[PDB]
Amino acid sequence: QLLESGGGLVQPGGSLRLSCAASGFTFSDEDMSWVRQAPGKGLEWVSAISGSGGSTYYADSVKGRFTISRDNSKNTLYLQMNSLRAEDTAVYYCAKSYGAFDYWGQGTLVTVS
Known about the structure:
It is classed as immune system. The protein is an all-beta fold. The protein has a single domain (1-113), classed as Immunoglobulin-like (Sandwich), CATH 2.60.40.10. The chain is 0% helix and 40% strand. It has no helices and 8 strands. The strands form 2 sheets. Strands 1-2-7-6 form a 4-stranded antiparallel β-sheet, with no helix packed on it. The chain has a 4-stranded antiparallel β-sheet with strand order 5-4-3-8, with no helix packed on it. β4 (43-49) and β5 form a beta hairpin. The radius of gyration is 15 Å and the shape is globular.
């Protein structure tokens, strides 16, 4: 169970803070990600954070604008979004980074030409 909140309408250049509430697992020990789906597009990975909070990771498109963070005492994940742009319009989801696959080391290529 993960429940996102904080979405809304923002002017370009604006800020917004998304919150994700986790339950039913040891949050402290889980690497968490934010991912998003722009309208019509697929799922795009935005940011990730280690269990401790000691390591953070950002997609090139958001590096320097977004800040990922967590509060393990409150079992909650955050995404602070600043300097927002049209490209940032999307449905945002929080997710366990490695709960499903491993994206970075997986994959097989199918080319239909």
